[PDB]
């Protein structure tokens with residue numbers, strides 16, 4: 001019954017709004033500078049970066065880490081709202097979060113991105129994509145595979161109500177390594193998938209096979225994760241004085 005699926009979509013959108021302070025709707029309002037009620041400060045070079053706070057590669061990279069830590073907390077809070085998630089085996093809850101978190105982080109990061117750069121500090125700032133490309137040897141290319149994905153993902157023109165369901169689909173995957181009880185997870189995802197299918201058809205009725213196209217984006221997400229992990233392996237060998245946040249460490253451990 002579509003009634004049940006619409007109620008699920010609404011519940012998820014409500015929890016998403018409650019769990020993620022900076023929505024795509026607010027991020028697009030900032031990025032499209034037309035509503036200059038609160039425009040971002042733009043960091044495009046070394047000089048602008050100094051005044052924006054009014055080694056540099058390491059400080060930027062670690063700011064990304066801290067933002068992911070905060071995102072993990074929001075995503076975990078959201079996950080608990082997904083009907084059935086907290087009733088799963090606790091080992092599996094942890095496993096679902098462990099593998100789902102970075103795929104959600106890069107999905108939602110696209111909301112804060114355009115072709116030219118990315119919002120930072122809760123939207124108060126905007127850091128240029130070419131400034132990020134211009135950082136020292138290992139850090140020079142850490143953001144570019146995120147921007148390339150966002151440009152493509154953002155062409156789908158999903159809004160927060162769509163993303164709320166898609167993020168839930170991601171979490172309740174069931175092909176995650178080491179899951180104990182796959183069937184209850186897959187049963188939740190089937191219902192989530194039905195809701196997402198109906199949501200995209202009602203919200204984007206002119207957008208042919210949006211559902212399929214969105215599901216194909218998972219390949220792109222999983223490949224951003226793998227390339228980030230190997231870059232981390234380079235970082236820890238050349239940057240022995242650089243601490244990684246323990247929450248991030250545990251997520252990355254044995255992935």
Ligand SMILES: C[C@H](O)c1ccc(CCOc2ccc(C[C@@H]3SC(=O)NC3=O)cc2)nc1
Pocket residue numbers: 059060061062063064065067068102105109118119120121127232248
């Ligand atoms: C510090 C500087 O002002 C700055 C620049 C850009 C942004 C936008 C967010 O850009 C992100 C990039 C990567 C990750 C994934 C992290 S990064 C890591 O090492 N492990 C993970 O999970 C998250 C977010 N925010 C702050």
Ligand SMILES: CCCCCCCCC(=O)O
Pocket residue numbers: 052053054121124125
């Ligand atoms: C790049 C800013 C990192 C700390 C955020 C607090 C500073 C506020 C600001 O950017 O104006």
Ligand SMILES: CCCCCCCCC(=O)O
Pocket residue numbers: 020021022023067071105108109110111112119120121122123
């Ligand atoms: C990546 C978007 C998920 C919500 C954005 C969190 C606030 C953005 C920020 O502080 O950089």
